[PDB]
């Protein structure tokens, strides 16, 4: 039987090469220079090269002669070994789609109306445009007022709108796109995309028990992980031999009073300790707060890292500074000196903190930052906190026991108790001293003396300002 030989081809032009070779064969099949090759293969997903079926390499070389697209495989060709010729032909494989071409590439598209014509479908999209303001971009909501104000290619029909290359929108882009230009299989969007429009998680080191089978109630530490049927290798108590368990047979059991973290859900990101393990309701206390958190056994993992649980000085405005008390995705929760917690945007300014600032307490004792001070008057009388930032007449106090605002509050300082030169770059004239008569330019100046670059001599000299007279 003949053999397949690899020939390097121009990328993106393999099917055209196959068509051209077929035409070449048919054109010369009756002439005195026949193509002795048998077939040409240009697979669908194999990009860069094609395959030629022949008994000889010389036949391949004499058959591809005159084809420029294969010139990079002309001098040398590589045979496909025998055992592997079955793999060249081996092939594998109100909804949501994702566009293939254009600026909306790989963007989620809610199939609004499917057209039975089998040419295009109507898709709901979030516009990635600059509203004809930068061009002469991330996903953001469609603003019809902005595109009406800026003008340009814009046609308005209330909530409906046509604009910028016949892009159609309503209230959100609503545009027809080719079905072959989108993917209908393997999108699987997330909850965030739902708003816009089982699972196994075992890790090494975690403790798991056995809920069923002849090996029941054996608790061991996870070694390896795989997808569905894990065939786990758990290090049980008082057993040197390693046994096998799938994911379904196991459960994330944890003994009382061990480090616990939450992988997902409402309680994700919080660390702490479990107190009593019931059949499935596992109750824990957080490291931050002493609130009861009840979790499923599967939503628990054994990690020994300390909780994260930040506190920067930011300028709410030039008349009032602010201290960040919580970091959020698009905002900062900031605590000012008034004691009012506010929610502000990311784009406040960073003020230069004065770590050497001195403040006076209620008893005329000097206090500084990182000083544990008791509050003896004001709204927060009775509490004790560590000074973190200072003002003319205010001081911010941190307290780990106080769960509000990460422990940050503020009190007035008096209700606490401790527990260039103008002459620079100016043409001057030395009117007195040994250097009299010389014109120069002032380099550096002080209260007493000033350096002068001497115009004439290759030297700079400092002299008293009383000896200088400006031109």
């Amino acid at each position: 039987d003949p053999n397949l030989w690899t020939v390097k081809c121009k990328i993106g032009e393999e099917r055209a090469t196959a068509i051209s070779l077929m035409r070449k064969f048919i054109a010369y099949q009756f002439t005195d220079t026949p193509l002795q090759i048998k077939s040409v293969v240009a697979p669908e997903h194999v990009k860069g090269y094609i395959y030629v079926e022949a008994y000889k390499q010389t036949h391949v070389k004499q058959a591809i002669e005159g084809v420029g697209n294969l010139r990079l495989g002309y001098w040398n060709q590589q045979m496909v070994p025998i055992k592997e010729m079955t793999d060249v032909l081996k092939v594998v494989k109100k909804s949501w789609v994702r566009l293939k071409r254009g600026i909306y590439k790989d963007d989620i598209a809610q199939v609004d109306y499917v057209e039975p014509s089998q040419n295009t479908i109507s898709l709901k999209m979030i516009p990635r445009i600059d509203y004809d303001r930068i061009k002469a971009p991330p996903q953001r909501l469609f603003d019809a007022e902005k595109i009406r104000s800026l003008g340009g290619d814009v046609a308005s029909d209330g909530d409906f709108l046509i604009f910028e290359g016949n892009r159609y929108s309503r209230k959100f882009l609503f545009k027809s796109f080719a079905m072959s230009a989108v993917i209908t299989e393997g999108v699987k969007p997330t909850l965030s995309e739902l708003e816009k429009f089982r699972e196994h998680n075992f890790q090494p080191g975690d403790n798991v028990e056995v809920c069923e089978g002849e090996l029941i109630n054996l608790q061991g530490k996870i070694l390896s992980v795989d997808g569905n049927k894990i065939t786990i290798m758990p290090k049980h108590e008082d057993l040197k031999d390693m046994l096998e368990f799938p994911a379904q047979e196991l459960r994330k059991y944890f003994k009382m009073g061990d480090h616990v973290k939450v992988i997902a859900g409402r309680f994700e990101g919080d660390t702490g300790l479990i107190v009593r393990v019931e059949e499935n309701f596992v109750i824990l206390f957080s490291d931050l707060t002493m609130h009861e958190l009840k979790v499923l056994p599967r939503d628990l993992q054994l990690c020994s890292e300390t909780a994260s649980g930040w506190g920067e000085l930011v300028q709410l405005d030039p008349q009032t500074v602010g201290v960040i008390v919580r970091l959020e995705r698009e905002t900062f929760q900031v605590l000012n000196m008034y004691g009012k917690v506010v929610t502000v945007r990311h784009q406040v300014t960073r003020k230069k903190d004065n770590r050497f600032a001195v403040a006076l307490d209620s008893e005329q004792n000097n206090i500084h930052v990182k000083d544990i001070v008791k509050v003896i008057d004001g709204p927060h009388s009775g509490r004790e906190g560590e000074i973190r930032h200072l003002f003319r007449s205010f001081a911010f106090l941190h307290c780990k026991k106080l769960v509000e605002n990460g422990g940050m509050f503020v009190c007035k300082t008096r209700h606490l108790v401790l527990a260039d030169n103008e002459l620079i770059g100016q043409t001057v004239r030395i009117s007195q001293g040994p250097y009299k008569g010389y014109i120069g330019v002032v380099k550096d100046a002080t209260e007493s003396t000033a350096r002068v670059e001497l115009h004439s001599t290759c030297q700079t000299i400092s002299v008293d300002r009383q000896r200088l007279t400006t031109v």
Partner: protein
């Protein structure tokens, strides 16, 4: 190469990908390999 694994593509293409990966790693450690090209940045300059 990982893509060819997790889809389960052909094996000869995996072997050629392994060949080129081996070449790239060796050139990264040592850009002097007899009978093989020197690594270039698409500007005809040998890479350190």
């Amino acid at each position: 190469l990982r893509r060819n694994e997790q889809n389960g593509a052909a094996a000869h293409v995996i072997a050629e990908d392994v060949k080129l990966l081996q070449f790239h790693v060796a050139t990264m450690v040592d850009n002097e390999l007899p009978g093989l090209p020197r690594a270039m940045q698409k500007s005809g300059r040998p890479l350190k």
